Design a protein around this motif. Structure first.
Motif, PDB file in Angstrom:
ATOM      1  N   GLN A 109       0.820  -1.205   0.000  1.00 16.54           N
ATOM      2  CA  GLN A 109       0.000   0.000   0.000  1.00 16.54           C
ATOM      3  C   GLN A 109       0.858   1.260   0.000  1.00 16.54           C
ATOM      4  O   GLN A 109       0.647   2.163  -0.816  1.00 16.54           O
ATOM      5  CB  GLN A 109      -0.947  -0.013   1.199  1.00 16.54           C
TER       6      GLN A 109
ATOM      7  N   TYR B 295       8.808   2.366   1.702  1.00 11.66           N
ATOM      8  CA  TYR B 295       8.147   1.612   2.761  1.00 11.66           C
ATOM      9  C   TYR B 295       8.823   1.836   4.110  1.00 11.66           C
ATOM     10  O   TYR B 295       8.157   1.893   5.151  1.00 11.66           O
ATOM     11  CB  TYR B 295       8.140   0.121   2.405  1.00 11.66           C
TER      12      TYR B 295
ATOM     13  N   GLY C 191      -0.469   5.283   1.869  1.00  9.78           N
ATOM     14  CA  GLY C 191      -0.251   4.963   0.471  1.00  9.78           C
ATOM     15  C   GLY C 191      -0.692   6.058  -0.472  1.00  9.78           C
ATOM     16  O   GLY C 191      -0.077   6.240  -1.529  1.00  9.78           O
TER      17      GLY C 191
END
Lengths: 56, 223
Positions: B65, B70, B219
């Motif tokens: 997402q 990340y 996201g």
């Protein structure tokens, strides 16, 4: 714990790297395998052919 | 039955009902870190078998997402997720009946408005801090314009998106609160047990949904 998890993943990667070093050196040495007998034997054989011609 | 305050004055009338609940749940969450895994291992151990599954689940629901970036947000998912669903355990599960605080009423952190609005504001200004580095430093909140229908918009929605997830948890904690209290107010404890498992359902379900919810906001925040 992030360090420990990426240590797990990189340990998988490292055993894969060891198997990859194995798979590459297998190709290299198995190429050498018949090539060493070919080099020695054919170097004797063709030189023999030429020496035998000049001695005929 | 009263969700307003604890009379803990701090110059500006702060609520202690948020304070003590937040303290105890935060403490249990941080103190489970070394039940048996104070010296962790590659081979999983006591606390490791708990923590690492959660970490991998968080990576699953986040990297899909969140996006390419990340790593700077792996705490962001795990803290909110673990904290909120364990605090919902403590809010719907932990009893405080025979000893009552003379000032206020305490069962949950997210009961009061302040807790969940603070967490929501945190996630949303984290979205804006993400957009700070990861969008044009001229326009980050009010960037997009189609064939003009969106001239005051893309910021009016994110004015209330923090309000969105805040009220999302607001009503859902008040839900299990009311469902637990009313049947005991009706008849002794042994009758609502058929639906106490129902009250436990959403309590256990809030984990993954809030994880993917604020992770979906994050996201969006990659941009």
């Amino acid at each position: 714990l992030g360090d420990f998890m990426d240590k797990r993943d990189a340990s998988i990667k490292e055993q894969l790297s060891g198997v990859k070093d194995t798979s590459s050196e297998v190709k290299q040495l198995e190429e050498q395998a018949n090539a060493v007998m070919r080099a020695a034997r054919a170097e004797i054989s063709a030189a023999l052919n030429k020496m035998k011609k000049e001695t005929q | 039955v009263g969700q307003h305050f604890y009379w803990q004055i701090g110059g500006f009338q702060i609520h202690g009902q948020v304070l003590i609940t937040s303290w105890v749940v935060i403490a249990i969450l941080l103190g489970s870190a070394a039940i048996a895994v104070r010296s962790p291992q590659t081979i999983p151990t006591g606390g490791q078998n708990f923590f690492e599954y959660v970490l991998e689940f968080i990576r699953d629901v986040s990297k899909t997402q969140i996006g390419e970036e990340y790593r700077p947000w792996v705490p962001f998912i795990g803290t909110m997720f673990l904290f909120i669903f364990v605090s919902n355990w403590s809010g719907a599960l932990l009893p405080w009946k025979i000893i009552q605080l003379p000032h206020g009423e305490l069962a949950a952190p997210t009961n009061d408005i302040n807790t969940t609005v603070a967490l929501a504001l945190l996630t949303s200004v984290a979205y804006f801090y993400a957009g700070l580095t990861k969008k044009g430093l001229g326009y980050f909140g009010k960037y997009i314009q189609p064939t003009p229908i969106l001239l005051p918009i893309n910021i009016l929605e994110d004015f209330t998106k923090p309000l969105s997830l805040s009220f999302r948890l607001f009503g859902n904690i008040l839900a299990d609160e009311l469902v637990v209290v009313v049947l005991v107010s009706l008849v002794p404890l042994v009758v609502p047990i058929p639906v106490m498992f129902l009250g436990l359902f959403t309590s256990g379900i809030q984990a993954l949904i809030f994880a993917t919810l604020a992770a979906a906001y994050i996201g969006e925040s990659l941009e």
